[PDB]
């Protein structure tokens, strides 16, 4: 199969500042990327589907867009409890092949 | 040409069966493209004018098997037996013609030819 | 001219023809992503 | 949108086969597309099989293809799965989620991608 990476595996940014995280595939991304974030001991949520589709029962924070091979995420307010991991999901094959990312994680600069 | 005896023209028919034996004696540019079409719509006609001549010979082997052969008219010894759809000379004279003449004798014409066919082999050698 | 000829709308044989031609016409032309054939006994 | 009454884990010991459960109820289940995830702790999540409910189609990964079976059934309205020879890195918790797909019944489709809808998930614990 196919399989994607996102790089860098961890950020390392203190909350407060603007955070853009993409996920990048050999083939087209302009419009069948997915956003996930499961907090540890939970099962994962979808953020942004399609890559500019919004998922129901979430705050309007975070979001998705950019063209090509450059995505961005827009983020007005940072809240530290959303702190958790980062899944990206590219399903663009038929017969079936979904092979997820491996998750990005960030914490607070905790002293 | 000889393909015409088959099927070329506008024949009416209709006529009397009996009556129509009367009838029996009587019977661009050089475009690559377009070149490559036409070679199939050619080849098409080519099919149908050689079938003609081999459906010709075939009919006139099995005549050949029947002992008349070149001949348009046939009188062979094999006096008509009345028990295939048993009529009368009057109604097959009167109300029957070509085309409606096979639709009553399509079930005996396999027999028909089969004894015609038999009624030959013993005179080669006696 | 004057010829009778006994047409059959109903037993047609060229209308089998052309369902069967029909018939592989779809079966390429169409993909279906998911097909289901009962095939019974 | 969608309840689920799921049974538990009934883990049987390393070894033997497995059969998680994933059972929904409350409303219609033939709409829903199904997903079944692997999670190996630590690591990634890892797409393991799809069944569409009202086709009964059934699509693996190449590697555990013919390892693997996830079987269903609208009667009761429940999806089975079947894990065979067991080996114990296998030991990871599985998530059978769900996806609306419109008016199956009616015929309509989606057959979106995504995974939106998660079940509870599965509990183990590792003793000597
Ligand atoms: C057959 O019909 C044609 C015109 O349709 C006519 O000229 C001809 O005389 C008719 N022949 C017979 C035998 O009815």
Known sequence: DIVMTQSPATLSVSPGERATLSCRASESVSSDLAWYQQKPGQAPRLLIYGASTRATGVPARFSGSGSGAEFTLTISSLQSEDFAVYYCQQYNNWPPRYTFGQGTRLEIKRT | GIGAVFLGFLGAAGSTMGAASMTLTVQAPEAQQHLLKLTVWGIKQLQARVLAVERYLRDQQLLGIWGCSGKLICCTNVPWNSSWSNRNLSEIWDNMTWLQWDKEISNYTQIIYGLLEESQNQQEKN | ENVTEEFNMWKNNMVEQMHTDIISLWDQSLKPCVKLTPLCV | ?128
């Open chain 4, 1 to 128: 949108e969608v309840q689920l009454v799921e049974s538990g884990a009934e883990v049987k010991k390393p070894g033997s086969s497995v059969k998680v459960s994933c059972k929904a109820s409350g409303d219609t289940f033939i709409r829903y597309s199904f997903t079944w995830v692997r999670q190996a702790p630590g690591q990634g999540l890892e797409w393991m099989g799809r069944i569409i409910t009202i086709l009964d189609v059934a699509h693996y990964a190449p590697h555990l293809q013919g390892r693997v079976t996830i079987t269903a059934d609208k009667s009761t309205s429940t999806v089975y799965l079947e894990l065979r020879n067991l080996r114990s890195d296998d030991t990871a918790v599985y998530f059978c989620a769900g996806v609306y797909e419109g008016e199956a019944d009616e015929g309509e489709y989606d057959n979106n991608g995504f995974l939106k809808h998660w079940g509870q998930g599965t509990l183990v614990t590792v003793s000597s």
